Design a binder for this molecule. Structure first.
Ligand SMILES: [K+]
Length: 384
C-alpha cells in the first residue's frame, strides 16, 4: 500500500504555497479536495500563515457536502456555484485576487464540476483575476477518448465545452486547452500546479489514493468507469441503471425484461472487455422503487479494451429487439429528451438511434472527432 503520485495539493504544500503568497485567495472545492491524510484543502490553506484564504465556493452537491452563509470551522464566507449563480458574479470576486480550484472529477463531460471550473475560469478572465488549478488524476486514465464533440446548439452546463464525452484530460490539462484554444470569452491568467508521477496509463486505483464519493452516486473509483456506460440513458429515468440500488451505473433493468434472454443477446455481441450477467433485483429508491426488475449487470473484465459509452446503446438495441413495443424513444418521458440531447452534445444521437434502434446508425457520428481531438490534446498534455 503506497500513494504513487503527488497531487496538486501535495505539490503546493511541498512548495510552501509560494504561488499564493501576497494574494487574497478564493477556493473552489468540495469534500474531494483533500491531501494524502484526507485533510481538506480548506483547512490546509486556512492554517497556512503565508496564505490569505478569504472565501469559499461550492459546486453541485456543495462544499463541506452539508447543504446539497459562513463556514463553521473557518468562519469564512461560502458562495454557492449552482443554479442561478453557477458562474461567479463580479460581486463574488471583488474580494479576491486568485481563484484556486481543487476538485476530483471523473473524466466525463456531463459531470458538472468541469463546467464549474471552466465557467469560473471565464469569470476570472472577465474580472482580471488569476486562476490556479491544483491538478488531480483523471480516474479513468488519460488515453480513452469517446463521443462527438458538443455542437453549438447543445452547449450547456452538462455539455459546457466542444470536447468529447470522455475527453481523456486531467482538469489541469483541460484548463490549459480551454485557455490555449480561446474556447472561453477571454484569455485567463492561468497557472496549473502540476502533479508528480501521474501517468496517462494510470486508473485511479493505481495512484494509491483514497476515493472520496465524487458525488453520492459515484461512491467508488470503479463507479467513474460506469458513469459513461449508462449515464446518458440514465437521463431518461426509463430503465433502472442501478441508481436507486447498490451498484449505481453498473447495470440495466426493467420490469418487462427476461434477464437470461437479454444477457444471452448482449454476450453474443462479443464486446471487447465486457461480460453481461443476468440479474434480478428490487430497487430501494428512484427508478422501479420496490418493484421486481430483471436485467443485466455489466462486468468490465478488461478496462483497457472496453469501449464504455457505447454500452448503453447496445443495451437499448438488444432490449428493443427483444421487446419491440418498449423502444426507448417511443415510451420514455418526452420531457427528458432535450436533456438526453444535451448530455450527448447533439440531437443526432437520439434522432439517428430512433430510426430503427440500431447503434450502427450512430457509431460513425460517435467516433468522428476522436482522431482530431487526440491530435489537439497533444499540444496540452502535461503527463506521459
Ligand atoms: K491562512
Amino acid at each position: 500500500p503506497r500513494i504513487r503520485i503527488k497531487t496538486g495539493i501535495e505539490v503546493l504544500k511541498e512548495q510552501n504555497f509560494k504561488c499564493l503568497e501576497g494574494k487574497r485567495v478564493g477556493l473552489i472545492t468540495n469534500p474531494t479536495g483533500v491531501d494524502n491524510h484526507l485533510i481538506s484543502t480548506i483547512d490546509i490553506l486556512h492554517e497556512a500563515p503565508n496564505v490569505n484564504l478569504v472565501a469559499l465556493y461550492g459546486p453541485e452537491h456543495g462544499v463541506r457536502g452539508d447543504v446539497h452563509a459562513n463556514d463553521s470551522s473557518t468562519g469564512l464566507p461560502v458562495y454557492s456555484l449552482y443554479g442561478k449563480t453557477r458562474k461567479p458574479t463580479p460581486e463574488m470576486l471583488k474580494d479576491i485576487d486568485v481563484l484556486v480550484y481543487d476538485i476530483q472529477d471523473i473524466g466525463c463531460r456531463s459531470f458538472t464540476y468541469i463546467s464549474t471550473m471552466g465557467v469560473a475560469m471565464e469569470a476570472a478572465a472577465e474580472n482580471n483575476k488569476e486562476f490556479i488549478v491544483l491538478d488531480r488524476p483523471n480516474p479513468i486514465g488519460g488515453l480513452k477518448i469517446e463521443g462527438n464533440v458538443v455542437e453549438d446548439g447543445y452547449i450547456s452546463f452538462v455539455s459546457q465545452f466542444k470536447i468529447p464525452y470522455l475527453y481523456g484530460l486531467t482538469c489541469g490539462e483541460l484548463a490549459l486547452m480551454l485557455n490555449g484554444e480561446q474556447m472561453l470569452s477571454k484569455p485567463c491568467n492561468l497557472h496549473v500546479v502540476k502533479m508528480k508521477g501521474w501517468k496517462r496509463k494510470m486508473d485511479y486505483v493505481q495512484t494509491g489514493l483514497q476515493w472520496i464519493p465524487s458525488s453520492p452516486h459515484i461512491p467508488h473509483p470503479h463507479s467513474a468507469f460506469f458513469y459513461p456506460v449508462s449515464g446518458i440513458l440514465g437521463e431518461l429515468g426509463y430503465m433502472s441503471i442501478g441508481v436507486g440500488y447498490t451498484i449505481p451505473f453498473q447495470m440495466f433493468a426493467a420490469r418487462w425484461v427476461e434477464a437470461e434472454k437479454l444477457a444471452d443477446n448482449l454476450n453474443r455481441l462479443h464486446l471487447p472487455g465486457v461480460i453481461f450477467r443476468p440479474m434480478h433485483l428490487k430497487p430501494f429508491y428512484s427508478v422501479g422503487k420496490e418493484e421486481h426488475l430483471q436485467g443485466v449487470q455489466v462486468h468490465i473484465v478488461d478496462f483497457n479494451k472496453a469501449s464504455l459509452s457505447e454500452i448503453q446503446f447496445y443495451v437499448m438495441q438488444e432490449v428493443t429487439a427483444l421487446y419491440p413495443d418498449r423502444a426507448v424513444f417511443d415510451h420514455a418521458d418526452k420531457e427528458r429528451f432535450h436533456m438526453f440531447d444535451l448530455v450527448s452534445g447533439s440531437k443526432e444521437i437520439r434522432e439517428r438511434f430512433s430510426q430503427r434502434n440500431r447503434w450502427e446508425d450512430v457509431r460513425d457520428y460517435w467516433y468522428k472527432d476522436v482522431d482530431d481531438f487526440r491530435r489537439l490534446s497533444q499540444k496540452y498534455y502535461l503527463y506521459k
